[PDB]
Design a protein around this nucleic acid. Structure first.
Ligand SMILES: [Mg+2]
Ligand SMILES: [Mg+2]
Ligand SMILES: [Mg+2]
Ligand SMILES: [Mg+2]
Ligand SMILES: [Mg+2]
Ligand SMILES: [Mg+2]
Ligand SMILES: [Mg+2]
Ligand SMILES: [Mg+2]
Ligand SMILES: [Mg+2]
Ligand SMILES: [Mg+2]
Ligand SMILES: [Mg+2]
Ligand SMILES: [Mg+2]
Ligand SMILES: [Mg+2]
Ligand SMILES: [Zn+2]
Lengths: 135, 119, 48, 76, 73, 175
RNA sequence: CUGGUAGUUAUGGCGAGAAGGUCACACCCGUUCCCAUCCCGAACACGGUAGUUAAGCUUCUCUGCGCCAAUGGUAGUUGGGGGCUUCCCCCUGCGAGAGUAGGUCGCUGCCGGG
RNA sequence: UGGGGCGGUCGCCUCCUAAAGAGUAACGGAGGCGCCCAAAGGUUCCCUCAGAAUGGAUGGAAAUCAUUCGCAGAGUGUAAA
RNA sequence: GUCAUGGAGGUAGAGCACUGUUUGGACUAGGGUACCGAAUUCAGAUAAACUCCGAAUGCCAUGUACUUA
């Protein structure tokens, strides 16, 4: 699973996800891509599952791109611990995706199997998506 | 293929080091010195207005004498002070110009002090 | 190692200044020429 | 089950202390800073810890020196 | 050039052992020998084996008999 | 100035009309000669640091000056400050007599004399040299030197490319 | 025409090519003294012009780099009002960053000579 | 003191939170201090770093030498600004 | 309080010019070809403790302005 090799600080703020995507709002590498319509956090587990289900249908033919990466980390507390006494220990890694950001790319396959592969990927992500193509 | 260090450029770098602490005003102007490999020049400047008041150099139509060009600075220093006194100037500050206050520039400064110039 | 010292006028004999020194760097007694208010002139001072 | 943080210093109240165009008494402080964010101009001196004060009575004028620097001056 | 630091560099002539050409050089040692070389001026002389005689660009033990025989003083 | 006689009266006139230089001011000429020892054993061999210093002087006559390290490296337990090498700057008329002890005396003396490297140029107009045994100079004493160190000799010329730089020294004389 | 000496946010810089010169300015020669190098008259210091425009310097050309820079649109946002409230929409005022049309191989002051 | 106890903390300096003047809390996120220097202070004069490539060396990736490029990519007694 | 004028300050936004994080290609001077010690370059992302930039408001002050206590 995609994790950073090392980080400067182990703890980070939750942040916010308001506004349009700063960059990457268009397809540049492949010819089809999944575009987010809403905004939500995407963990690294959902990136992996949406990728195996995406290359398995393509039978390992053609190249896919991952346009997002889980830079930020989040923490959690055990059950039975009261509030306070510091901060929790990190658990996973997330990538806050604002609306209008392409998350995947497809090239090297015909029209029929490009849309179907993207369709199976979208069902594993918690955001409402749309299949978009280049020009 | 060692390239040669430019003489004037390095001097100008040392010129600004002193020039930070020395600036000529209207009441107390600055005495500048430019030394050449064959001559030597002196100038009186007030940096507040960027104006030259009086000057003299080892190129005028008089005092023709080239005794190893070290005492020529003494003659040059004897004219700037005389012309400064005629123009009503009393006290100045010596701008070393980036040179070393040892030889030709020392002799020019010494002559000015003897004549009508206050340091 | 780094102790406090007091300086004494060699003529008057009255302590006038306090400074510091390194014991293992200056084992001798420091001597400096400071201003003595009683005599109103610079006089040699050495550590007690 | 504990935190090793929880330490902070005391704020030093930095920043400007007089405004542009305001008449100012000599010896008064104009700008408290670390390092030299603003250089002392005319009739302005920098103290031991880089506080710009005024030497003579006049009017404070923050003004721009060469392309990437600032200075403060006092004009009678 | 500063006084009292560097050993001497007074000139000394230099010669071979087979061609014996009087060549000027600057050195701190006079080889315990001196000649009136050039136009009436007194220059020391250095003697060493063949230098630049060939430089890869020009029997009773061979030298065994010759060197010992010459060594007879 | 034996080489200077050829350098000033025989070498230079054969270059002005050889490379179509617009003036004599563009003719390449020697600038300085340097010697470097770099005996790093002085980390423990304190005496050896000054042992070769006087040895290096006798080859030139000028007093060498102690050179210290620029920083500290952990691999060779080097600490900043200790003498590492020596400097001798042959300048002025000395690029006309010191090398005469080389191109006529030194190279023929070495145990395996065959020539100099034809490619040992820095790539911009200078030439270097190497010596492997420390008793090559005509004014050295074999029994007086206990240790041997590898030297670095550099000749600096005002030549702009390796073409002319090689053929001045080639005309100056060495294999 | 040139040598000094200041102001001006690099539109003033960098790089490239050409022309010029003892009237200046430099390159250059030497080390007797003043002075000088952790050694080195390289620099500094001093004494001159045998040689030179190949360098520095001056003039000329550029858009290759750099620098400066609109108009329109957009993000954002004070005030007012709405929602289906991870957030989103409407009216009025302000209004970037990036990208771009475009400009640039400088502009003024004083003194001494030719 | 998200009940009390066990654990941790108690004074000073630096950064973020801190919402473009100043100030601003939490058992919120990161670090230091309880010194050192007789020159590591004053003044006068002078100059410029890291790193890389290239050729020669005992001597190796890295020790000292030369050239070139090099607006700080170094340094500033010590933590950060 | 509003208006006109002058300022200090790096948030929102944006950006890769520094520092961390990071994707896909050309790229393996030299170790024994990422396994690299790695570096150059093209294209594309990211940041509370990044900044070549940078607002709206807020704040400080001057005025001879108009109103108001
Ligand atoms: Mg603080
Ligand atoms: Mg101080
Ligand atoms: Mg203090
Ligand atoms: Mg600028
Ligand atoms: Mg003429
Ligand atoms: Mg004498
Ligand atoms: Mg606009
Ligand atoms: Mg703009
Ligand atoms: Mg605020
Ligand atoms: Mg504040
Ligand atoms: Mg602590
Ligand atoms: Mg305003
Ligand atoms: Mg932001
Ligand atoms: Zn006393």
């Amino acid at each position: 699973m995609l994790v950073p090799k090392r980080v400067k600080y182990r703890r980070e703020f939750r942040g916010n996800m308001r506004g349009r995507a700063k960059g990457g709002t268009e397809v540049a590498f492949g010819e089809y891509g999944l575009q987010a319509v809403e905004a939500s956090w995407i963990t690294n587990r959902q990136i992996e599952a949406a990728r195996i289900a995406m290359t398995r249908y393509m039978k390992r033919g053609g190249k896919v791109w991952i346009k997002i990466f889980p830079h930020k980390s989040y923490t959690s507390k055990p059950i039975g611990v009261r509030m306070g006494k510091g901060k929790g220990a990190p658990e996973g890694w997330v990538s806050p995706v604002k609306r209008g950001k392409i998350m995947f790319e497809i090239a090297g396959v015909p029209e029929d199997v490009a849309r179907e592969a993207l369709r199976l990927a979208a069902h594993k992500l918690p955001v409402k998506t749309k299949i978009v193509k280049r020009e | 293929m060692i390239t040669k260090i430019d003489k004037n450029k390095v001097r100008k770098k040392r010129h600004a080091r002193v020039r930070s602490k020395i600036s000529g005003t209207e009441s107390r102007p600055r005495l500048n010195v430019f030394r050449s490999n064959k001559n030597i020049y002196a100038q009186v400047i007030d940096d507040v207005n960027g104006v030259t008041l009086a000057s003299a150099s080892n190129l005028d139509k008089d005092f023709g004498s080239a005794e190893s060009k070290v005492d020529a600075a003494s003659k040059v220093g004897e004219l700037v002070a005389k012309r400064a006194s005629e123009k009503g100037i009393t006290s100045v500050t010596f701008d070393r110009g980036g040179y070393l206050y040892h030889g030709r520039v020392k002799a020019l400064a010494e002559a000015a002090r003897e004549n009508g110039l206050e340091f | 190692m780094r102790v406090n010292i007091t300086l004494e006028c060699t003529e008057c004999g009255d302590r006038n200044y306090i400074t510091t020194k390194n014991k293992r760097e200056n084992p001798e007694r420091i001597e400096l020429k400071k201003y003595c208010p009683r005599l109103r002139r610079v006089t040699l001072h050495r550590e007690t | 089950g504990s935190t090793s943080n929880g330490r902070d210093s005391e704020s030093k109240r930095l920043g400007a202390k007089r405004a542009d165009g305001q008449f100012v008494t000599g010896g008064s402080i104009l700008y408290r800073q670390r390092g030299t964010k603003i250089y002392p101009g005319t009739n302005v001196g920098r103290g031991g810890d880089d506080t710009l004060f005024a030497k003579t009575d006049g009017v404070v004028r923050f003004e721009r020196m060469g392309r990437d620097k600032k200075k403060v001056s006092v004009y009678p | 050039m500063k006084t009292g630091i560097h050993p001497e560099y007074r000139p000394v002539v230099f010669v071979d052992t087979s061609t014996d050409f009087k060549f000027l050089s600057g050195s701190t040692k006079s080889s315990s020998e001196t000649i009136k070389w050039e136009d009436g001026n007194e220059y020391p002389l250095l003697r060493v084996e063949i230098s630049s005689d060939s430089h890869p660009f020009y029997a009773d033990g061979r030298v065994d008999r010759f060197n010992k025989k010459y060594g007879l003083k | 100035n034996r080489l200077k006689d050829q350098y000033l009266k025989e070498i230079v006139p054969a270059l002005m009309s050889k490379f179509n230089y617009d003036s004599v001011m563009e003719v390449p000429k020697i600038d300085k000669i340097v010697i470097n020892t770099g005996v790093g054993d002085a980390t423990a061999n304190a005496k050896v640091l000054d042992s070769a210093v006087e040895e290096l002087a006798l080859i030139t006559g000028q007093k060498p000056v102690i050179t210290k390290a620029k920083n500290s490296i952990a691999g060779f337990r080097l600490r900043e400050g200790m003498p590492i090498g020596a400097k001798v700057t042959l300048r002025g008329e000395r690029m006309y007599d010191f090398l005469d002890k080389l191109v006529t005396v030194s190279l023929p003396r070495v145990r395996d004399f065959r020539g100099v490297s034809k490619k040992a140029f820095d790539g911009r107009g200078n030439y270097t040299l190497g010596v492997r045994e420390q008793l090559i100079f005509p004014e050295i004493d074999y029994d007086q030197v206990s240790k041997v160190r590898g030297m670095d000799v550099v000749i600096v010329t005002t030549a702009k490319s390796d073409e002319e730089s090689h053929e001045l020294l080639t005309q100056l004389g060495m294999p």
